[PDB]
Amino acid sequence: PFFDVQKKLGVDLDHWMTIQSAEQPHRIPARCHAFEKEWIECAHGIGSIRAEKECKIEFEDFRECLLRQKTMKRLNAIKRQRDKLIKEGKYTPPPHHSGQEDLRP
Amino acid sequence: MNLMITLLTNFTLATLLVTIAFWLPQLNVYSEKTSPDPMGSARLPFSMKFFLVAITFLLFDLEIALLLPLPWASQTTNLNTMLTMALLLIFLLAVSLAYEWTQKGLEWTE
Amino acid sequence: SMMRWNRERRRLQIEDFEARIALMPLLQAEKDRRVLQMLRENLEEEATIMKDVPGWKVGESVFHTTRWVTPMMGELYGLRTGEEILSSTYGFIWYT
Amino acid sequence: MMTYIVFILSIIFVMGFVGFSSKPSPIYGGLGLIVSGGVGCGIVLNFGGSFLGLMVFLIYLGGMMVVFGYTTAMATEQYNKVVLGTFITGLLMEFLMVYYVLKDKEVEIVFKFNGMGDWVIYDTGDSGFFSEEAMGIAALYSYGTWLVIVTGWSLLIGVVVIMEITRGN
Amino acid sequence: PGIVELPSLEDLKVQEVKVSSSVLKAAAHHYGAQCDKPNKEFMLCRWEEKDPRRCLEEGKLVNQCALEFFRQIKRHCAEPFTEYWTCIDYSGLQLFRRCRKEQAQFDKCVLDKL
Amino acid sequence: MSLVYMNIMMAFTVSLTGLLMYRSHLMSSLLCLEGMMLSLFILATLMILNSHFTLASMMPIILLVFAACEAALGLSLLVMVSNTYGTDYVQNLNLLQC
Amino acid sequence: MWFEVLPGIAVMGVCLFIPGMATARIHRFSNGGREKRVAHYSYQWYLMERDRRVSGVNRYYVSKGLENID
Amino acid sequence: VAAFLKNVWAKEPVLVASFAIAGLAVILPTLSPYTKYSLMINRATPYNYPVPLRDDGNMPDVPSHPQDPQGPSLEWLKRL
Amino acid sequence: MFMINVLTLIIPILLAVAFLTLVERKVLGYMQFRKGPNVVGPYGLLQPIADAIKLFIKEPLRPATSSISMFILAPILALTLALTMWIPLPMPYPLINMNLGVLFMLAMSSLAVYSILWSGWASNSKYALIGALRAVAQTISYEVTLAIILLSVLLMNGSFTLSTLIITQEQVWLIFPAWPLAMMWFISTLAETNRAPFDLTEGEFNVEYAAGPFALFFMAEYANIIMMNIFTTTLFLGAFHNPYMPELYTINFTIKSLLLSITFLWIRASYPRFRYDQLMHLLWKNFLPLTLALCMWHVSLPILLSSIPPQT
Amino acid sequence: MNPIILIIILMTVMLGTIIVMISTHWLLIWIGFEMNMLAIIPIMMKKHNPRATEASTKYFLTQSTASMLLMMAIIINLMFSGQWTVMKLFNPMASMLMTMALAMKLGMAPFHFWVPEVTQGIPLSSGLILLTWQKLAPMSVLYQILPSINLDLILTLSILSITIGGWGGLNQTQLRKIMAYSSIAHMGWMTAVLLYNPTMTLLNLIIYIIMTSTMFTLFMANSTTTTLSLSHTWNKAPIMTILVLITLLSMGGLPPLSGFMPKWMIIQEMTKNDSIILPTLMAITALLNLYFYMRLTYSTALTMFPSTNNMKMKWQFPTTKRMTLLPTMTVLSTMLLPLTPILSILE
Ligand SMILES: CCCCCCCCCCCCCCCCCC(=O)OC[C@H](COP(=O)([O-])OCC[N+](C)(C)C)OC(=O)CCCCCCCCCCCCCCCCC
Ligand SMILES: CCCCCCCCCCCCCCCCCC(=O)OC[C@H](COP(=O)(O)OCCN)OC(=O)CCCCCCCCCCCCCCCCC
Ligand SMILES: CCCCCCCCCCCCCCCCCC(=O)OC[C@H](COP(=O)(O)OCCN)OC(=O)CCCCCCCCCCCCCCCCC
Ligand SMILES: CCCCCCCCCCCCCCCCCC(=O)OC[C@H](COP(=O)(O)OCCN)OC(=O)CCCCCCCCCCCCCCCCC
Ligand SMILES: CCCCCCCCCCCCCCCCCC(=O)OC[C@H](COP(=O)(O)OCCN)OC(=O)CCCCCCCCCCCCCCCCC
Ligand SMILES: CCCCCCCCCCC1=C(C)C(=O)C(OC)=C(OC)C1=O
């Protein structure tokens, strides 16, 4: 039983806290506002059964924005290869990745 | 970082003073004291009233926790709704106090 | 007295906020050039590090879409020293 | 070491729960949950949640664990192998997790977890002249109307229920 | 997926506005009045493109129009401006309300000479 | 995912198994229950502060208040138990086996 | 008489005058003869870190004015 | 309504002051003429950036410069 | 350099607590038509030094503690919380300038009852435990009106920033819009620190501590007294602040806080003690209804006057 | 209890269940369960004896543990989905934890271990609320999360609930434990047809609530809590023996009665999905429930156990109890099978 009293009576009891793409105070965007807006506008109206297979790209984009697992795995690979080349002496860091370059602005 | 250093300094000063208080007069070689209370050995009687004032504290402190964002909530653009809900929270705290009154909850610690 | 003075304080707050608003285009342009500088530096150091690893695409987006994504803290300050890391990632929180 | 500090606090956090999940005595359990609340508050403070961490102090520790220690001090009249065994068991489980995720930079107990410090996942922008956390909590009175109604009604009913079930009549 | 395309380091070179935050805040309202047009071109480009790489050249115009703002202060009113941003610079919250006579001298000199 | 979530979830499961394996006391059980609530507070807080989802910042406070009220209820239940047997021992609560 | 309590109040008042005077002089000494920068908000921290980068001496408080532009 | 009020003010003046202050706090914002100015000041405080509009060709009331006459004015806030 | 600033905070706190004992004995002496100490030092100034040397070489009382660990931790927690209540205090600049210094102080004062509770349970006396439960219930009772009065006053401030509370009071003292909140605040902070007429720990919990640790509890309690008077001074009697001469603010708030601490000393030599139910009646049936009514008034009042203070 | 306070507390129970039913946010679901538990605790402690306090303590522990697992499932849903809609769950770990939490709230086996205790400890009216109204909100959440419910988990909980609630009541002489093990078996029947057709779940829930309300209303009318006290009914109120006869023959699923209606329809929606073994085993296991229903009808209606002398006094006082809806519920729980296609109103 989902007695949709809110849509029937036209009141907004809890839809505002439901998603990150909703109206936030002082127009603060979430860090994955665009990804969630794209996933919601993809998966709207077509049902969950169609939405699990027809909006997989937007949902993988949004999940990887949220958790950043592919990003952190890529950073793990870059940093670990960098540490191996430092340990082998095949590589040196640049001066701008050591703190001796007087940052931009 | 300055705050963590300050907390560590205050804890270290307190522990140093407590160690001096618990170990400087131990070096006194005074005397061994042979055979070192209104109730003799009876058990502690449970007071229902102390527990009642503690739970009344806890519930009104939860209502305080709801009231704590009000200096930030006065800055909103939806001020009629904000003012209504603020007066409604303080009114429900007052209704909690009135019900605690009239059902003899504030008795012998009034 | 509190009426007059809190009204004056609101006008002073609006003045400070419009000073901020007048400064936000320049700070936004410098911020954009700052993050693009750091991403180009990370890209070139990835190109000179990730030469041995088979099947690696340098600068490959982990996202499917080609829309710009705001850079993560580890994406920008990953290859740098821990002093710049701590200053960027807990500097404001630990400040006094 | 300092870039891992939240992680280090979180390790203390897990240790603190083994300080009372082994259940030595409810007063030592209360002390362990107080130290756990302090370090978990510090974890909340290090993502920028100052108001939420001060709710952990003012309401969880200074409000509620006061009442736990108060009620416990009115019981357990003042004067183990299983406790210390379970304590070292949970401690060795947690340090094996630490050792695995620090030697592999990846672990999977139930979910996959990264092994780098959690500073990496943060945002690189500013929030202007407001804390987003403070304004989202200030939003409780304008946007959060139904939530305030049901929370205040549940607290009023909580006062009524506590007075009913402790009266004995 | 695909390769992200970043601009080269030559595309990011520009004459940086290397002044402090009190120098910016003291000169803020005249910067918001006089450097209006390329700033609003840039910020409209920045909220419509939603991508800073598509907004670089307009930003250069910002970094072009800011410097001409300060040179035109330096050619005519460097001394009341310096006296004003020093008093702004003393304060911890950088209050305008502590610094009204220096603001009055700076606004009088800018309204006369510029 | 992030590494601090590992420790907050594992803390929740530690306090779960503490709340799911009683020793003697009902107070130690309520301590494990409120440790579970505390770990939920920390975990929801780190998510909401992570994703900058602004409106859910009032969410953990609510998660505090209700559940803290819940704790009050449990404490009163414990007191009624301690107003029958003199202790809060869970082995005295076996009158309902028959 | 009643002015006999005044040496103890004077000692206690000097002992309360020391912390505020000391933190004011330390905030002037550690920040280039000025107040400590209050950064309660992330915009204020953004400006303060921009000052740290534009000074060239890795210090936010060393200010750069019209002499730094051409 | 008259003897009862003097009786409760004689016996329990703390409660009478409580309900009087709470009653003024309820009713007086609905009767105050300055309640509207609170709304108008809180909506005129610019926390965000005033993101400009693309001039399509027909916006007669939107200014091109902040010092232009058209647009929202705050002379009521300066004067009061 | 910051460590020097922490030392110049915490060492003069200890010195002012040491000489507050002399000021208490002298002011209670002259209000009782006698003198206070004037033999041990010149004008009595060496009495706290003599008394500290006396207490630190007195025999340890050596109790049978229930828990050794909490018997150690209760003075440690009392002194640590007594010292950390000073670091957001703006005078005119705090040691730790934070955005939520008010709420920080309310939190660290809410944590102060664990020292009383652990010292009461760590003693084997059931009488000491009953006294500790009474003192904890008293303190957590008056923390309610501390929180609500403090919230109602900070509705005129705009934030929980203590440094903003000086900017708030540059045209008027905040006691003029909020004197009923001020007087209930003042009596509630008098009831926080177990101070007369609310001192039922002296009327017939840490009596099992030796002279050293009992002196540490005593000095933590007087550090709380000086601190709550300074916090009441900043909160209701905000002094003039010239930013180019901060010592004007420092001399001014020091004079006001000394007068307010002498006002605590002047209350304790004027009234008899409440019975325990009488100050419970004072909280729950007198202070808390007016506190809620004035909280409604100070919510609705900046809206009806258009005097809502700035967020920043 | 003060009757005004009783009305406010029952409205708060109903309010918490309605807040679960009508809300689209997960925090409001959790709030509805918290409000529901917090308000139902005094209904259990109404008579103030140690059995009610023990039952309320056990109920508090199980429902608090379920609420914590519910909030953990919600938090993992916010991890792996970034949002709060009460809909399908975007992680099998959060799906497993929420199915466990709702199984603990319903008392489905092997989390059934609080249902025969608490129902024994509390009065018949509070047990009526616990076995009828407190099944509404978790079945509503299970209605709305069923695209993410694991099949083997819900079917394991269902068959384990049916078998354990069948073998529970065979050893029982206390009527409230009989209704509790009947509750466990029927909740297994409701959740077994859940992922196939939730309309039949709703039909089983409505028919079970009608029959359980009929049986508790008869128990409150006759003031009997044991089998052997229910056996005195024929010498006092002979019509009530006929009513408990037809209602217990209904609850066993015997045609032509209405309690045959749900389980048959459940089989009617499970043989469509090519499950033949599972509804057969479920139907054969329901014979255990029907066996102890037949035991109760033998003790009450079909034989005459010996009564005592003082019963002759109770012949002189008619029933002054407000037997609310007892003819209506007695008719609806027996003679509703010719109206079987009415179930489309639940679609
Ligand atoms: C910050 C600087 C200091 C601030 C001032 C404080 C300094 C003075 C200290 C004096 C020594 C105090 C020693 C401890 C005393 C404790 C006992 C005590 O006083 O109990 C309090 C007493 C307690 O009551 P009681 O016990 O005296 O009276 C009997 C009470 N019954 C009947 C319940 C038994 O009074 C209060 O609670 C009053 C609190 C403050 C009231 C403020 C009211 C302000 C006016 C509001 C408006 C009124 C008009 C109506 C509306 C008009 C609208 C236009
Ligand atoms: C509508 C406005 C908002 C209202 C809600 C907000 C209130 C804010 C303040 C919080 C109050 C919380 C506590 C309320 C408890 C009320 C019940 C009560 O105290 O009754 C008992 C009392 C007599 O005291 P007694 O029981 O004898 O005490 C023993 C010691 N002698 O009985 C009495 O003293 C009689 C009390 C009832 C009559 C009070 C009348 C006051 C009228 C003031 C002027 C009009 C103000 C406008 C609002 C009127 C609302 C009725
Ligand atoms: C921030 C400021 C804080 C200030 C805190 C302290 C306030 C009070 C400061 C001290 C005021 C003066 C104290 C004088 C004490 C009495 C000294 C005296 O007269 O001692 C005499 C005694 C015997 O001498 P004898 O030679 O026998 O005399 C016979 C003469 N034919 O000889 C002796 O006893 C030996 C000499 C002992 C000297 C002790 C002096 C007092 C030390 C107190 C500690 C604090 C020091 C000051 C700190 C702040 C200033 C830097
Ligand atoms: C039984 C054990 C022993 C008992 C005695 C000792 C423990 C009890 C007494 C000490 C209590 C310590 C309290 C520590 C946290 C206090 C809250 C806090 O830090 O608030 C201040 C501030 C928030 O203000 P804000 O301005 O927003 O932050 C700056 C950015 N603008 O936030 C900040 O500035 C954040 C700074 C970075 C994060 C700091 C984290 C500190 C370390 C973790 C907590 C330490 C205490 C753990 C044990 C507590 C036991 C009660
Ligand atoms: C998709 C589905 C959505 C939801 C659909 C609707 C679901 C309906 C669930 C019904 C739950 C009923 C719960 C119990 C009734 C609530 C009120 C209550 O507590 O009544 C009992 C009350 C207590 O009286 P008391 O003084 O305690 O008596 C003790 C003896 N001296 O009074 C008594 O003891 C009096 C004795 C007779 C009471 C009979 C009450 C019958 C109530 C149930 C009617 C049938 C359900 C509605 C129709 C079917 C709908 C599915
Ligand atoms: C080393 C720093 C000081 C350590 C603490 C000792 C001095 C302060 C407390 C001593 C004290 C004084 C002066 C005192 O006067 C007094 O009586 C009212 C006490 O007992 C209740 C005391 O404990």
Coordinates of C-alpha atoms in Angstrom, one line a residue, chain B residues 43-44 46-48 50-52 54-55 57-59 61-63 65-70 72-73 76 78 81-82 85-86 89 92 95-96 99-100 103 105, chain D residues 2 51 55 58-59 62-64 66-67 70-71 73-74 77 134-135 137-138 140-142 145 148-149 151-153 155-156 158-160 162-164 166-167:
Chain B
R43 CA 21.9 -1.3 49.4
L44 CA 21.3 2.0 47.6
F46 CA 16.4 3.4 43.9
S47 CA 14.7 6.8 43.6
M48 CA 12.1 7.0 40.9
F50 CA 15.9 11.1 40.1
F51 CA 15.3 9.0 37.0
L52 CA 12.2 11.1 36.2
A54 CA 16.9 12.8 34.2
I55 CA 14.5 11.6 31.5
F57 CA 16.1 16.6 31.0
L58 CA 16.8 14.2 28.1
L59 CA 13.5 14.9 26.4
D61 CA 17.2 18.6 25.7
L62 CA 16.0 16.9 22.5
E63 CA 13.5 19.7 22.1
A65 CA 18.3 20.2 19.9
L66 CA 15.4 21.0 17.6
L67 CA 15.5 24.7 18.7
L68 CA 19.3 25.2 18.1
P69 CA 19.2 26.2 14.4
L70 CA 17.0 29.3 15.1
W72 CA 20.4 30.6 11.3
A73 CA 16.7 30.0 10.5
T76 CA 15.3 32.6 5.5
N78 CA 10.1 31.8 3.9
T81 CA 6.5 29.3 7.7
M82 CA 9.7 29.6 9.7
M85 CA 7.3 26.3 13.0
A86 CA 9.5 28.0 15.6
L89 CA 8.3 24.0 18.5
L92 CA 5.2 21.9 22.0
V95 CA 2.9 21.6 26.2
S96 CA 5.4 19.0 27.3
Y99 CA 1.7 17.9 30.8
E100 CA 4.7 17.2 33.0
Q103 CA 0.0 14.8 35.8
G105 CA 5.5 14.6 37.2
Chain D
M2 CA 48.6 13.5 9.1
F51 CA 27.3 21.9 14.1
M55 CA 25.3 18.0 18.5
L58 CA 25.7 18.5 23.5
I59 CA 23.0 16.0 22.8
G62 CA 26.3 15.8 27.2
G63 CA 22.6 15.0 26.9
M64 CA 22.1 11.3 26.6
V66 CA 24.8 11.6 30.9
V67 CA 21.4 9.9 31.4
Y70 CA 23.1 8.5 35.7
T71 CA 20.7 5.6 35.4
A73 CA 24.9 4.7 38.7
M74 CA 21.5 4.1 40.3
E77 CA 26.0 -1.8 43.3
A134 CA 24.6 25.1 8.6
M135 CA 22.1 26.3 5.9
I137 CA 20.1 22.6 9.1
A138 CA 18.5 26.1 9.0
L140 CA 14.4 22.7 8.9
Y141 CA 11.9 25.5 9.5
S142 CA 11.2 26.7 6.0
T145 CA 7.6 21.7 8.0
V148 CA 9.1 19.4 12.4
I149 CA 5.5 18.5 13.0
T151 CA 9.3 15.2 15.3
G152 CA 7.6 17.5 17.8
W153 CA 4.6 15.3 18.0
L155 CA 8.7 14.1 21.4
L156 CA 5.4 15.2 23.0
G158 CA 7.5 10.5 24.2
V159 CA 7.0 12.7 27.3
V160 CA 3.5 11.2 27.7
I162 CA 7.5 8.0 29.7
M163 CA 5.1 9.4 32.3
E164 CA 2.6 6.5 31.6
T166 CA 6.9 4.8 34.8
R167 CA 3.8 5.5 36.9

